[PDB]
From a paper:
These transporters bind the Fe3+-siderophore complex and translocate it into the periplasm. The structures of pyoverdine, pyochelin, citrate and ferrichrome iron complexes bound to their respective transporters FpvA, FptA, FecA and FhuA showed that the ferric-siderophore complexes were bound inside the barrel adjacent to the plug domain, a position thought to be poised for translocation. PfeA has the same two domains (22-stranded β-barrel and N-terminal plug) common to the TBDTs.
We constructed four mutants R480A, Q482A, G324V and R480A-Q482A (double mutant) to validate the observed recognition site. Each of the mutant proteins was purified as described for the parent protein, and crystal structures of each were obtained. These structures were essentially identical to that of the parent protein, which confirmed that the mutations did not affect the folding of the protein. Co-complexes with Fe3+-enterobactin were obtained by soaking for the R480A and Q482A mutants. Apart from the mutation itself and an additional water molecule in R480A, the mutant complexes were essentially identical except that the B-factors of the Fe3+-enterobactin molecules were higher reflecting a bigger mobility or a partial occupancy of the ligand. Mutant Q482A showed biphasic isotherms, but with much reduced heat output and smaller K1 values. We further note that in order to form this binding site, the protein undergoes the same conformational changes for all three compounds and in Q482A and R480A mutants.
Author numbering: 24 to 721
């Protein structure tokens, strides 16, 4: 099965029958437990949604490629409301070179450590064979409404042997998703008056991709393998008017249709793999270098996250991320039969950002200990980590898996993340699973940095109208979460029925603070002597929900599958507001008809439940009017198919959103001056869209 309790596999076959436009989030999000959301509740950058596991936010979803971390979004400014203007990190590997995807949710993910408090998504690539193989994949879609951006995608792969002990695989992808038209939300925008009249919330950003990966596998002995791989990728956007607050100016408009951010991502990795008598061994060194070049934005008030016209032009933020990992695996023959794993891990994150730390203090007054001009660009953190797993067979069919992970973060201090995972055959058809772990979150380098400084004259300040600063805070604690799950699954002859309950108790969630810690001195007029807030740890928050699956084989050629997410709770227990905005439930339904040996056909439905916006504004006050708007439940249906022409050639074709259900971003969630709020209506849902596809492979 592709769904056990806590875990989902997506195969290459699934990727082909629900072909993604471009980013994998599209298909990853259809698993149980998984949503596609922003990180907090502002609605800012709300068309830039990313994979969210059990409502824990997408910063707590750790993305791996072939077991190796992706850190690139940590190169984008982390803003006052916990969003980055980033597309996330699931669009680095092209869909057609993926062998499979693993999604691991809650207690089974905490053993991976930093940033897995929601879970892990591990994107696995196809590997070289016994003979030389390769493929050519093309995809092209066609929206009904021309406003919306079409997508085109071309990718190859090519792999095989060279000597008897030498293998290679390479692939390369070129793709484009056109942006939505700059005006796509016209007539649907929130009410905009005075200076802000005419402003627009934006449609989906476009992107251009170039990815090129090369790998050599060398197995210098029967027991010993050595891999070298390098990746070069580049995403450049197509800008369509998006700004943090939905305000506009002339620089914004000048840039409509142009590249305004480009991310270059380079990865190099050496991996040694060892298999002998006492068991298995594995170690790797990865260097990820991310360059994030974008137009300078402002860092104050309504000017936070809009192109700054006084400082026109590009800056480049640089992320050097360094990862090395070691492990061994020992079968142990003892009074209980078992498997032991011992490992270290070391990472370094260097961040150079010459832009984010440049807000100055001439208006709100200055801040003792913080220079107003030429603050450092630099941040870094190292975590060292040790861990051990034991995989214990109590009695055949029953497994107990304890592990301990310890992490030393060189600023925040020591973390202890223990875990315990149980599975139990109760019957030959029924299996009970339980897991309880404490997962780990390192503050990001923006939260942590006393030189990172934002400003507002009042509207964004919690509990007051005066000017205020927000400041990074090196005193911060790590976020930890006690992720519980209890689940039960019937499985027999492709009949599958399972239901899991999960609760994550969430401690020290980091977030812009509520009380001033101090006041600056000096500055101009009514803004002088502004209040100073920091990034704080929220003492307690909770998420809670249900994951279900049901799979029935209607007849031989024909399979009916369903995945269910239901979100019971999502609560900042300090403020009482919600953490993320999710749909109350999500049901995904596929019917799969294997009509002939050669022709497969697929119908799908997704039902999304209601969605509620935040209740409180940036002041902490209760919102009014269109800031309260909710999104009603809706469903999206789709048909597609794949017709095999030969061993060497298949064709695909279908329609996403059969019934043309469309939604439109009206703005951000709350009122500001001149720009009424849009509540939960913060994203654009695309309409009917035809697509075709073609895959040739030897
Ligand atoms: O969405 C927000 N703005 C909107 C809506 O607010 C406004 O348009 C006005 N605004 C206030 O009167 C205000 C009254 C009382 C208190 C204020 O802070 C006001 O701004 C004017 O400000 C501006 O025109 C611009 N703005 C600055 O230059 C600025 C420069 C330095 C410092 C600033 O604070 C600035 O606004 C752009 O502002 C906007 O478009 C918004 C969000 C989050 C936090 C904010 O502070 C926002 O203002
Ligand atoms: Fe302001």
């Amino acid at each position: 099965t592709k769904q056990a309790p806590g875990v989902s596999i997506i195969t290459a076959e699934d990727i082909a029958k629900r072909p993604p436009s471009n980013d994998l989030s599209q298909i990853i999000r259809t698993m149980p437990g998984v949503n596609l959301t922003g990180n907090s509740s502002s609605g800012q950058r709300g068309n830039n949604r990313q994979i969210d596991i059990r409502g824990m936010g997408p910063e707590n979803t750790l993305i791996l490629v072939d077991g190796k971390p992706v850190s690139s979004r940590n190169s984008v400014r982390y803003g006052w409301r916990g969003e980055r203007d980033s597309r996330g990190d699931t669009n680095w590997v092209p869909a057609d070179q993926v062998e499979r995807i693993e999604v691991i949710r809650g207690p089974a993910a905490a053993r991976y450590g930093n940033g897995a408090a929601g879970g892990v998504v591990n994107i696995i690539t196809k590997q070289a064979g016994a003979e030389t193989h390769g493929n050519l994949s093309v995809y092209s879609n066609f929206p009904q409404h021309k406003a919306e951006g079409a997508s085109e995608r071309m990718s190859f792969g090519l792999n095989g042997p060279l000597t008897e002990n030498l293998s290679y695989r390479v692939y390369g992808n070129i793709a484009k998703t056109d942006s939505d038209d700059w005006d796509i939300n016209a007539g649907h925008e929130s009410n905009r008056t005075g200076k802000q009249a005419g402003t627009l919330p934006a449609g989906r950003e476009g992107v251009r991709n170039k990815d090129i990966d090369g790998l050599l596998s060398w197995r210098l002995t029967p027991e010993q393998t050595l891999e070298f791989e390098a990746g070069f990728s580049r995403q450049g956007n197509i800008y369509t008017g998006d700004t943090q607050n939905t305000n506009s100016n002339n620089y914004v408009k000048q840039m409509l249709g142009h590249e305004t951010n480009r991310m270059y991502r380079e990865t190099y990795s050496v991996t040694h793999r060892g298999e002998w008598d006492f068991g298995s061994s594995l170690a790797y060194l990865q260097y990820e270098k991310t360059r994030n070049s974008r137009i300078n934005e402002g860092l104050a008030g309504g000017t936070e996250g809009i192109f700054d016209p006084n400082n026109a032009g590009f800056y480049t933020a640089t992320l050097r991320d360094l990862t090395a990992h070691g492990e061994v695996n020992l079968p142990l023959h003892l009074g209980y039969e078992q498997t032991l794993t011992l490992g270290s891990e070391w990472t370094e994150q260097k961040l150079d950002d010459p832009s984010s730390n440049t807000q100055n203090t001439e208006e709100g007054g200055s801040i003792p200990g913080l220079a107003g001009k030429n603050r450092s660009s630099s941040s870094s953190a190292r975590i060292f980590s040790l861990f051990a797993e034991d995989n214990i067979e109590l009695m055949p069919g029953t497994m107990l898996t304890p592990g301990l992970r310890w992490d030393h973060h060189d600023i925040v201090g020591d973390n202890w993340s223990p875990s315990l995972n149980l599975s139990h055959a109760l019957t030959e058809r029924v299996t009970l699973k339980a897991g309880i772990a404490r997962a780990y979150k390192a503050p990001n380098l923006y939260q942590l940095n006393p030189d990172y400084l934002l400003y507002s004259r009042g509207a964004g300040c919690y509990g007051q109208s005066t000017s205020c600063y927000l400041r990074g805070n090196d005193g911060l604690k790590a976020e930890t979460s006690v992720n519980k799950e209890l689940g039960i699954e019937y499985s027999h002859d492709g009949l599958v029925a399972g239901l899991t309950y999960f609760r994550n108790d969430y401690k020290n969630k980091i977030e812009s603070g509520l009380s001033p810690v101090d006041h600056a001195s000096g500055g101009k007029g009514d803004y002088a002597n502004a209040a100073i807030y920091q990034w704080e740890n929220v003492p307690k928050a909770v998420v809670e929900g249900l994951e279900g699956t049901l799979t029935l084989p209607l007849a031989d050629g024909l399979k009916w599958s369903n995945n269910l997410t239901y979100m019971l709770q999502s609560k900042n227990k300090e403020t009482g507001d919600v953490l993320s905005v999710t749909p109350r439930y999500t049901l995904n339904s596929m019917l799969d008809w294997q009509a002939t040996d050669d022709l497969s056909l697929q119908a799908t439905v997704t039902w999304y439940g209601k969605q509620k916006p935040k209740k409180y504004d940036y002041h902490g006050d209760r919102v009014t009017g269109s800031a309260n708007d909710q999104l009603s439940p809706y469903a999206i249906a789709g048909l597609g198919g794949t017709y095999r022409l030969s061993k060497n050639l298949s064709l695909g074709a279908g329609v996403d959103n059969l019934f043309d259900k469309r939604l439109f971003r009206a703005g951000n969630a709350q009122g500001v001056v001149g720009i009424d709020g849009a509540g939960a209506a913060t994203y654009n849902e695309p309409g009917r869209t035809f697509y075709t596809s073609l895959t040739a492979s030897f």
